[PDB]
Swiss-Prot record, chain B:
GO terms for molecular function: guanyl-nucleotide exchange factor activity; translation initiation factor activity; translation initiation factor binding. Its main location: cytoplasm. Acts as a component of the translation initiation factor 2B (eIF2B) complex, which catalyzes the exchange of GDP for GTP on the eukaryotic initiation factor 2 (eIF2) complex gamma subunit. Its guanine nucleotide exchange factor activity is repressed when bound to eIF2 complex phosphorylated on the alpha subunit, thereby limiting the amount of methionyl-initiator methionine tRNA available to the ribosome and consequently global translation is repressed. This is Translation initiation factor eIF2B subunit epsilon. Belongs to the eIF-2B gamma/epsilon subunits family. GO terms for biological process: cytoplasmic translational initiation. GO terms for cellular component: cytosol; eukaryotic translation initiation factor 2B complex. Component of the translation initiation factor 2B (eIF2B) complex which is a heterodecamer of two sets of five different subunits: alpha, beta, gamma, delta and epsilon. Subunits alpha, beta and delta comprise a regulatory subcomplex and subunits epsilon and gamma comprise a catalytic subcomplex. Within the complex, the hexameric regulatory complex resides at the center, with the two heterodimeric catalytic subcomplexes bound on opposite sides. The modification Phosphothreonine is found at residue 160.
Curated annotation (Swiss-Prot), chain C:
It comes from Schizosaccharomyces pombe (strain 972 / ATCC 24843). This is Translation initiation factor eIF2B subunit delta. The lineage of its organism: Eukaryota, Fungi, Dikarya, Ascomycota, Taphrinomycotina. GO terms for cellular component: cytosol; eukaryotic translation initiation factor 2B complex. It is found in: Cytoplasm, Cytosol. GO terms for biological process: cytoplasmic translational initiation. Keywords: Cytoplasm, Initiation factor, Phosphoprotein, Protein biosynthesis. The chain holds residues 106 to 465 of 467 of the full protein.
From Swiss-Prot, chain D:
The gene is gcn3. Belongs to the eIF-2B alpha/beta/delta subunits family. It is found in: Cytoplasm, Cytosol. It comes from Schizosaccharomyces pombe (strain 972 / ATCC 24843) (Fission yeast). The lineage of its organism: Eukaryota, Fungi, Dikarya, Ascomycota, Taphrinomycotina. Component of the translation initiation factor 2B (eIF2B) complex which is a heterodecamer of two sets of five different subunits: alpha, beta, gamma, delta and epsilon. Subunits alpha, beta and delta comprise a regulatory subcomplex and subunits epsilon and gamma comprise a catalytic subcomplex. Within the complex, the hexameric regulatory complex resides at the center, with the two heterodimeric catalytic subcomplexes bound on opposite sides. Acts as a component of the translation initiation factor 2B (eIF2B) complex, which catalyzes the exchange of GDP for GTP on the eukaryotic initiation factor 2 (eIF2) complex gamma subunit. Its guanine nucleotide exchange factor activity is repressed when bound to eIF2 complex phosphorylated on the alpha subunit, thereby limiting the amount of methionyl-initiator methionine tRNA available to the ribosome and consequently global translation is repressed. This is Translation initiation factor eIF2B subunit alpha.
From Swiss-Prot, chain E:
Component of the translation initiation factor 2B (eIF2B) complex which is a heterodecamer of two sets of five different subunits: alpha, beta, gamma, delta and epsilon. Subunits alpha, beta and delta comprise a regulatory subcomplex and subunits epsilon and gamma comprise a catalytic subcomplex. Within the complex, the hexameric regulatory complex resides at the center, with the two heterodimeric catalytic subcomplexes bound on opposite sides. Pfam families: IF-2B. One of its GO terms (biological process) is translational initiation. It is found in: Cytoplasm, Cytosol. Keywords: Cytoplasm, Initiation factor, Phosphoprotein, Protein biosynthesis, Translation regulation. GO terms for cellular component: cytosol; eukaryotic translation initiation factor 2B complex. The gene is tif222. Belongs to the eIF-2B alpha/beta/delta subunits family. It comes from Schizosaccharomyces pombe (strain 972 / ATCC 24843) (Fission yeast). PANTHER family: TRANSLATION INITIATION FACTOR EIF-2B SUBUNIT BETA (PTHR45859:SF1). GO terms for molecular function: guanyl-nucleotide exchange factor activity; translation initiation factor activity. The keyword Phosphoprotein applies. This is Translation initiation factor eIF2B subunit beta.
């Protein structure tokens, strides 16, 4: 059961487990986080044969901290709201600024 | 009240083949499920929907089909609908019936269409209101497909019913559809639907009962596009690809009640277990719609009145026994349905089998996962492994073993069957 | 705050027999203090948003978390480890309490951990005091919980007999580990799984047992009268055993026991020792714990889904208020045995075992 | 009365399994039984049940075991008497008296029983109060109210 | 002795069609619930009487019985069917014996009583729309202010029972939804009870034992009452009675009389009915629905020694007096149909 | 005013359990209406001031008084007797109820007499109508009570066995009338007389039985556990028997039956048939009648002997209230037999007997 929206934009708010930073050091072919890293992560989520390496797990990355509680799977979720959350790339600057008037006097 | 009577046509003979070794003696739409002919399961479904005028296409055994209907309960004035039968060419393909339909100009308004025989208990009275509404503002609403929420690996979801739908989560409009085939590795659709749809939902959890709610134009449309043969691989595909011009279809995913179609060998078994298990209430033996004498017993055991249950015979769970049927001593039955007036020997072992009207089994017989048609006899010391299928009249000699899937027959086709005993390594008729 | 709140929390002593049951919950980290170690917060969320959180696993994860707290603790070297450490811990439970009331499996563990704090010698340095506590906790986990479970599993399996048909209710990971261990030793039997609204905790016991190849049946609690005729024994894992002999477990646990007694079937209670308590209740309303009433609004057979109940305004409708307790007290005369790691004891023999440990 | 040795025969001659149980072992038997059924030598105004000596013995076990207790009685056995306790019945012979001694010194053991003199001291009959009988089977139908036994009884004696 | 032994299934459809149409509606649960069964059972026999021709009375009581015997095997558990039949049978042989005597009394063969039976049948139909309206008034002798009350699931008879008291007395009731089968209507009832000024609280079915400790009375509506005073009631009611008796809490049953039936509960397993498991576990959990046994009964038997009071359209009566309501309403010849 | 009072009688449904029980009593002749017959006045005084007023003698004196009322009644010339006579009588009841609530015995008598007035033949005359129902009344006193008593005592004494130890409680004239019989028929037995506060009704039973030469034993209700070990049978006279089989008598009657059953003694209920009621009571609080609370202030072994106590100002001290219910109900599982004039019946068989008299077509 897969739902998918189209009128959705990124907000560039990502929160990562620590271990992913070592992946960024190794996998040099990652230029933009939003452009490259996220889809890289989502492919590995379900693609079976796409299991080049999970070694960047259980390597004493400290998730208990001696026996793993989160190994056989890598997860990644999304979250949506209703108002006041975007990022300027030109045309927003006119708008996000206008949106920035819940001020007073 | 009129309501254009609400018509409904039933496409029998459409899936007449896959039940091959038996359908040549009597058609699929009349063989028993839980000691009850299929079309009855379909009819009471139709009546549940408020249908008032039914037309049944027939090709194989159109006589004994109609003869049953004529003497059925549905030919009475108490019936809620007036069933008429229709004959056409043998091995009838969908649409070719629809084309023959409007050539008779007998479709008045919105109707339902069923390709085969269906067990179900979903009240469509809500689906039509769903259908007839969004149509009254967009006369290009053509077909409303009703489907059942389920698991991807559900026992009641096989290849033909295994499909992938893409629906507008707001208005429930199937914008893309494709069947699941070993090899079809990807799901591909032109993205221009995204520019016309905000919130889509890709679902592989459906069933596709193929109980579509068809509009008024559909038959005439099938005559305009004479190429369309299959309602799922020719019709809808043409609508989604804009072959048929500027028309929409909609999906109604039911989340409660039950719906499925008796179509394949790997479904008759499944659905039997699904109606024995009370999934299709009230359509259960305990209702006795045809004046049977069934009664629910614990662990899903169903018996009729006047049944010879020998002491020291052990009846396990999930089984069903018709009336006038005898069972020997030290015999064991489990997860098998049994037609009326059968006769089971002594010191036997049955499991996962299916027995029909008046069948005779000798002493010391072992059976499993086998279909035993009407009026067949088995000698003593025999044994039948899984997958076996025998037709009527067939009789097996004593001290014999029928291998798996070894379908038999009492007729003159290519199948290995022949009646008299012994009938495996010892051969009759060849 | 608490000065004014304590008057509020007392003004709630009026007509509603549930007026005293505290309903206040902190489900977010909004306005959270700073004294709070991360691993405590991650637990505070799990305490408030998880719903299949066994009474054991909480006490485990609580203590394991407490280890990290004490490890990462930095005592003010203007003092020593002993003084100003419970005060640090005390300021952690107050958060952890506000996210969900303390179980009985947790309080006694906390009540114990606070003692070993107060008794260790001052000669030890802080790095010595820590490493000591870490041992006592790890021992408390193995001796009082895990091993005790492994004993109960065996002893309970003994009274299982081939041909039995036993009844569990609402996923007690202890009584699952029995049934699981019961099939592996080859005991021939089958299971009845009684579930109930709102959070059908049963259909996960059905999942586990089925994934182990166990014959099982699934009926809601309103089918007890119909299904008890098949059952032969009843197995219950409790949240705690009171000192009167009563079994303090979840909702229908009483009706399970009561209906069984009125059908001559036994109510076997599996509960570890540390869940025992000196507390004693006459009714299932004095001490209890509330759940969100909105979870009743959902009609059909699913928790969080698209069921716009006809009561979704009960918070705003006058004279209509939903509620759902989540523990209830069953008298002894229905419970026939408590199987603890000290062996199979009569439920009424609880306070002796409590006074057994209190010799220290 | 020893009539048990006879009833088991009367059933066996019709292909009915039988297991004779000692008078002292009905309790152990209950959890196996699904329903207990007895005859009646007399029915009482209070819906009571005057029958053989052991009926009330197992009428209470059925209560304690929550298994239904049914009794069969013919209408020509409704008697117009009323006991207050399970003992208020007329004694043909004085029963259950004690010996008066004086300083005179004088597994299975089936041959060790009371003499024919001790037995005659023991009572012949026994009465079960109506709260222990789930229903009464009569030609007038199945009666269970134990106030409807009186209406029917009153309907007779007039 | 059913009807098919008398009239061929086809000619039944021409003589009395509504009968043949009712059996279909009766087995297919198109008409369920005892009330809906009752009223439709009566007015069907109305046309029957208005459509059969006969000479002697013994023709009817042998004919109307015969159709009833089939009208029961349609769906026997909906007991209100035979109860309307059994009451009609006495209605004629009373109107017979009264006329056969008042003609003998006129002294020093007229089967034109059909319109009297119709005037006698319609009488009992008008009694049905007068079931709660004369039951709701008994509350003010049982419900009192500040009391705490417990019920279970939708039961308009019990609903109207309380709301009448709520007119003047204010008090509190506790509702246990009849999961899984009485969930919808039960919630609605509480929402209605709130409007009437009743401190109503909705609880899970399992929360019953907890709150009973401080419950004054429990009120229950049944699906039928059997010849031993036992109760056939919608699912989950034994949980209430058993919890009540554990607290010496009085149990009260507010039921109409058309459900009072003389059939004796021999085997319970032939009484309870089993609905679809769809009401208990979703069809999606495919792994589970295959590997397990799932059952959803929607009736429940509670024995008669557990009810302390019966609120009926005739008044309050102990269970040990139900039989006198039978024999004053039925005839023992018509126990079996 | 009445509706204004009816508004008051509504607000008396508050937190207190006994909010609804009516305390309004008139113990004087102040402001009496005129349409009140003298013989009714003397009665209403006896009701509110007597204390050993058995539920039987009340119904008798009420009827014998009612004869004197009807005998002296005078219908207006423009109306027959039947029309506008209950109205007169109804104006008498409303007074009598304001002195002390109607017993169940008295009530059914009212319901019966009010009926025979309706069915009364209009084609008669006054002196025809009067002289008639005076016999109906005298017949009611004959068959329904006096004879019925004589049946009960004989029927009750039959189950008295030589060597018994009988236990009565709080002076039931019927229960006294049977023990005195059992004495005079030669039955060898002895009596236990359980009494209780506040108006020690038991002494007058002890007084009677002693003057008839009966071995008696006198203990307060607090000694039930101590004294039941000697008792073998329990005899109770009721104020009424409910339709569910319960027994509606004075206060301790419930404990007497309870403590007895937990010591395996039978509870024998001696009650007439006119005291049967079509109603039922789940608790001893919904339907009852209060006594003044002041009666248990004079704590001493007396009630008239004006020796005070500590609670004398209870009416003036907040959060303090004394009460004394006069009746409670006893579940039928504790009553063993009811001794109606139709013989020894089980208590549950009451409503049938009620429906038996409704044969009055």
């Amino acid at each position: 059961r897969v739902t998918l929206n189209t009128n959705l934009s990124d907000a560039h708010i990502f929160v990562f487990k620590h271990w992913v930073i070592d992946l960024i050091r190794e996998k040099e072919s990652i230029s933009s986080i939003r452009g490259d890293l996220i889809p890289y992560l989502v492919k590995c989520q379900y693609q079976k044969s796409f299991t080049v390496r999970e070694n960047i797990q259980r390597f004493l990355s400290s998730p208990s901290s001696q026996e793993i509680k989160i190994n056989a799977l890598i997860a990644k979720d999304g979250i949506i709201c209703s108002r006041a959350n975007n990022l300027p790339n030109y045309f927003e600057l006119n708008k996000c600024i206008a949106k920035l008037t819940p001020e007073q006097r | 009240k009129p309501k254009h009577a609400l018509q409904a046509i039933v496409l029998s003979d459409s899936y007449n083949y896959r039940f091959r070794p038996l359908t040549l003696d009597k058609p699929r739409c009349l063989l028993p499920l839980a000691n009850t002919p299929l079309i009855e399961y379909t009819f009471e479904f139709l009546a549940l929907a408020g249908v008032q005028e039914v037309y049944v296409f027939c090709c194989a055994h159109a006589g004994q089909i109609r003869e049953y209907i004529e003497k059925s309960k549905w030919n009475l004035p108490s019936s809620p609908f007036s069933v008429n039968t229709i004959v056409s060419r043998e091995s009838l393909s969908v649409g070719d019936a629809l084309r023959e339909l409007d050539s008779k100009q007998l479709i008045t308004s919105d109707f339902i269409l069923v390709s085969g025989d269906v067990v179900s208990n979903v009240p469509l009275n809500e689906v039509l209101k769903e259908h007839r509404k969004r149509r009254e503002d967009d006369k290009n609403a053509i077909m409303t497909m009703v489907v059942r929420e389920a698991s991807p690996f559900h026992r009641t979801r096989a290849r033909t019913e295994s499909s992938v739908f893409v629906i507008d989560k707001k208005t429930s409009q199937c914008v893309h559809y494709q069947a699941n085939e070993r090899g079809k590795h990807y799901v591909s659709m032109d993205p221009e639907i995204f520019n016309e749809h905000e919130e889509l939902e890709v679902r592989n959890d459906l069933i596709d009962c193929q109980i579509d709610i068809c509009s008024n134009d559909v038959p005439a449309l099938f005559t305009e596009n004479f190429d369309y043969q299959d309602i799922r691989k020719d019709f809808v595909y043409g609508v989604l690809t804009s072959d048929l011009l500027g028309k929409k279809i909609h999906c109604h995913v039911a989340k409660e009640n039950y719906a499925a179609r008796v179509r394949s060998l790997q479904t008759y078994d499944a659905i039997s277990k699904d109606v024995l298990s009370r999934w299709v209430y009230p359509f259960v033996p305990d209702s006795n719609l045809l004046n049977q004498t069934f009664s629910y017993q614990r662990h899903q055991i169903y018996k009729e009145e006047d049944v010879v249950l020998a002491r020291s015979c052990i009846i396990k769970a999930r089984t069903l026994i018709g009336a006038y049927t005898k069972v020997g001593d030290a015999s064991v039955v489990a997860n098998t349905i049994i037609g009326r007036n059968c006769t089971i020997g002594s010191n036997c072992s049955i499991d996962s089998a299916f027995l029909w009207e008046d069948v005779v089994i000798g002493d010391n017989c072992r059976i499993g996962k086998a279909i035993l048609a009407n009026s067949v006899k088995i000698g003593n010391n025999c044994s039948i492994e899984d997958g076996a299928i025998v037709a009527a009249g067939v009789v097996i000699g004593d001290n014999t073993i029928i291998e798996k899937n070894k379908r038999l027959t009492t007729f003159e086709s290519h199948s290995q069957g022949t009646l008299n005993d012994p009938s495996l390594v010892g051969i009759g008729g060849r | 705050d608490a000065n004014l709140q304590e008057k509020k929390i007392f003004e709630e002593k009026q007509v509603s027999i549930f007026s005293h049951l505290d309903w206040r919950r902190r489900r977010t980290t909004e306005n959270i203090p700073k004294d709070i170690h991360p691993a405590v917060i991650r637990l505070g969320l799990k305490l408030a948003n998880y719903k299949i959180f066994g009474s054991n696993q909480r006490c485990i994860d609580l203590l394991k978390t407490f280890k990290i707290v004490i490890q990462d603790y930095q005592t003010p070297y203007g003092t020593t480890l002993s003084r100003h450490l419970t005060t640090h811990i005390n300021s952690q439970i107050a958060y952890l309490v506000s996210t969900r009331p303390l179980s009985i499996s947790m309080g006694n563990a906390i009540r114990f951990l606070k003692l070993e704090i107060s008794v260790l010698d001052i000669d030890l340095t802080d790095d010595e005091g820590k490493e000591l506590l870490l041992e006592k906790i790890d021992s408390y986990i193995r001796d009082r919980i895990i091993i005790a479970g492994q004993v109960i599993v065996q002893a309970a399996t003994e009274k299982i007999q081939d041909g039995d048909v036993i009844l569990t209710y609402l996923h007690s990971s202890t009584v699952n580990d029995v049934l699981i261990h019961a099939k592996n030793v080859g005991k021939k039997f089958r299971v009845v799984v009684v579930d109930s609204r709102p959070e059908f905790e049963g259909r996960v016991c059905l999942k586990l047992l089925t994934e182990h190849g166990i014959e099982c049946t699934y009926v809601m609690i309103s089918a007890l009268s119909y299904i008890m005729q098949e059952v032969t024994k009843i197995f219950l894992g409790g949240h705690a055993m009171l000192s009167n002999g009563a079994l303090y477990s979840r909702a229908g646990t009483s009706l399970i026991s009561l209906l069984g007694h009125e059908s001559n079937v036994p109510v076997i209670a599996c509960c570890e020792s540390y869940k025992f308590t000196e507390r004693i209740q006459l009714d299932s309303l004095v001490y209890n714990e509330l759940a969100p009433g909105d979870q009743l609004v959902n009609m059909g057979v699913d928790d969080f889904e698209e069921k716009p109940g006809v009561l979704a305004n009960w918070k705003s409708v006058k004279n209509l208020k939903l509620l759902s307790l989540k523990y209830d007290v069953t008298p002894p005369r229905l419970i026939t045995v408590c199987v603890c790691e000290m062996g199979l004891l009569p439920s009424t023999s609880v306070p002796a075992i409590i006074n057994e440990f209190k010799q220290v | 009365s020893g009539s048990g040795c006879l009833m088991t025969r009367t059933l066996k001659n019709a292909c009915i399994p039988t297991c004779m149980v000692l008078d002292s072992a009905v309790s152990f038997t209950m959890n196996r039984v699904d329903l207990v059924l007895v005859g009646a030598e007399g029915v009482v105004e209070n819906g009571g049940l005057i029958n053989q000596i052991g009926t009330f013995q197992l009428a209470v076990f059925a209560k304690h075991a929550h298994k239904p207790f049914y009794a069969v009685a013919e209408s020509h056995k409704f008697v117009r008497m009323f006991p207050l306790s399970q003992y208020d019945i007329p004694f043909s012979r004085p029963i259950l008296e004690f010996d008066d001694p004086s300083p005179e010194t004088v597994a299975i053991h089936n041959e060790l029983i009371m003499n024919e003199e001790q037995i005659r001291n023991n009572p012949t009959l026994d009465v079960t109060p109506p709260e222990f009988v789930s229903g009464l089977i009569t030609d007038l139908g199945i009666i269970d109210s134990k106030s409807g036994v009186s209406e029917e009884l009153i309907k007779l004696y007039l | 002795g059913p009807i098919s032994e008398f009239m061929s299934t086809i000619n039944v459809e021409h003589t009395y069609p509504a009968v043949s149409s009712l059996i279909a509606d009766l087995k297919s649960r198109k008409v369920q619930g005892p009330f809906a069964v009752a009223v439709e059972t009566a007015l069907v026999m109305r046309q029957v009487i208005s459509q059969t021709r006969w000479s002697t009375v013994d023709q009817l009581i042998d004919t109307v019985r015969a159709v009833g015997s089939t009208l029961v095997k349609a769906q026997p558990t909906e007991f209100s069917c035979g109860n309307i039949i059994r009451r009609i049978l006495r209605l004629i042989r009373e109107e017979y014996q009264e006329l056969l005597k008042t003609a003998d009394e006129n002294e020093k063969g007229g089967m034109d009583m059909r319109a009297v039976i119709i005037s006698g049948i319609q009488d009992v139909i008008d009694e049905l729309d007068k079931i709660n309206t004369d039951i709701e008034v008994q509350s003010m002798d049982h419900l009192h202010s500040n009391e705490i009350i417990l019920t279970q699931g939708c039961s308009k008879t019990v609903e109207a029972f309380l709301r009448f008291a709520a007119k003047k007395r204010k008090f509190s009731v506790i509702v246990a939804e009849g999961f899984p089968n009485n969930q919808k209507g039960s919630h609605a009832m509480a929402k209605r009870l709130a409007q009437a000024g009743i401190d109503t609280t909705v609880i899970s079915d399992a929360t019953i034992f907890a709150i009973m400790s401080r419950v004054n009375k429990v009120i229950l509506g049944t699906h039928a009452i059997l010849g031993n005073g036992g109760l056939v009631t919608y699912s989950g009611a034994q949980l209430v009675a058993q919890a009540a008796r554990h607290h010496a809490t009085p149990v009260v049953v507010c039921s109409g009389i058309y459900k009072l039936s003389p059939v004796y509960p021999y085997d319970l397993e032939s009484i309870i009915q089993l609905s679809s498991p769809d009401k208990i576990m979703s069809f999606n959990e495919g792994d589970l629905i295959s590997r397990a046994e799932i059952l959803n009964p929607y009736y429940d038997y509670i024995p008669p020694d557990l009810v302390d009071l019966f609120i009926t359209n005739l008044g309050g009566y102990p269970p040990s007096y139900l039989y006198r309501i039978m024999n004053d309403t039925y005839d023992a010849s018509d126990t079996i149909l």
